[PDB]
Design a protein around this motif. Structure first.
Motif, mmCIF file in Angstrom:
data_model
loop_
_atom_site.group_PDB
_atom_site.id
_atom_site.type_symbol
_atom_site.label_atom_id
_atom_site.label_comp_id
_atom_site.label_asym_id
_atom_site.label_seq_id
_atom_site.Cartn_x
_atom_site.Cartn_y
_atom_site.Cartn_z
ATOM 1 N N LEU A 1 0.982 -1.321 -0.021
ATOM 2 C CA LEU A 1 -0.539 -0.484 -0.148
ATOM 3 C C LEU A 1 0.933 1.112 0.527
ATOM 4 O O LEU A 1 1.585 1.094 1.012
ATOM 5 N N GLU A 2 0.677 2.139 -0.733
ATOM 6 C CA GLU A 2 0.983 3.285 -0.817
ATOM 7 C C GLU A 2 1.173 4.191 -1.060
ATOM 8 O O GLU A 2 -0.081 4.791 -1.684
ATOM 9 N N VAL A 3 0.844 5.682 -0.317
ATOM 10 C CA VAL A 3 -0.012 6.088 0.417
ATOM 11 C C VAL A 3 0.769 7.943 0.366
ATOM 12 O O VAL A 3 1.639 7.753 0.961
ATOM 13 N N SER A 4 0.547 8.537 -0.704
ATOM 14 C CA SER A 4 1.243 9.732 -1.445
ATOM 15 C C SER A 4 0.684 11.277 -0.434
ATOM 16 O O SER A 4 -0.633 10.834 -0.620
ATOM 17 N N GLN A 5 1.534 11.961 -0.866
ATOM 18 C CA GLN A 5 0.989 13.187 0.123
ATOM 19 C C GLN A 5 0.142 13.643 -1.647
ATOM 20 O O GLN A 5 -0.003 13.924 -2.445
HETATM 21 MG MG LIG Z 1 5.550 8.324 -0.497
#
Ligand SMILES: [Mg+2]
Ligand SMILES: *[C@@H]1O[C@H](CO)[C@@H](O)[C@H](O)[C@H]1NC(C)=O
Length: 112
Positions: free
Chosen positions: A104-108
């Motif tokens: 899981l990647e949650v980016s700004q």
């Molecule tokens: Mg990131």
């Protein structure tokens, strides 16, 4: 083999929700067994964050659900109010055993 399938990588942005579907084999034992979502940690253990016995980590209070759908041999993990701190390596699985790795990647939130 490949008993469990799900999304290998899930990309989101801070504030978003995700709905992660894991598929399991078509058997009664699998339909009725414990389902879980866990985060892989540095110690090598995968720490349960939500399970079908009704367990919830305080990290997910107010923001997660795990719903078993025996009618189509799947279960869904819903995770809301994501932040960058949710980025990690997870597993969905059956039992304690059968599992599938989800990154899981949650980016700004992008600057305007
Ligand atoms: Mg990131
Ligand atoms: C499984 O069934 C549930 C309940 O009808 C449905 O909401 C969900 O979309 C189905 N999952 C898939 C992968 O078809």
């Amino acid at each position: 083999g490949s008993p469990i399938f799900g999304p290998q990588e899930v990309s989101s942005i801070e504030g978003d929700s995700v709905s992660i579907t894991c598929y399991y084999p078509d058997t009664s034992v699998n339909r009725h067994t414990r389902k879980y979502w866990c985060r892989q940690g540095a110690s090598g253990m995968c720490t349960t964050l939500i399970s079908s016995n009704g367990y919830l980590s305080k990290e997910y209070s107010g923001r997660a659900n795990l719903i078993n759908f025996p009618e189509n041999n799947t279960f869904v993990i819903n995770i809301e109010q994501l932040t960058q701190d949710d980025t990690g390596s997870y597993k969905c699985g059956l039992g304690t055993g059968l599992s599938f790795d989800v990154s899981l990647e949650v980016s700004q939130v992008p600057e305007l």
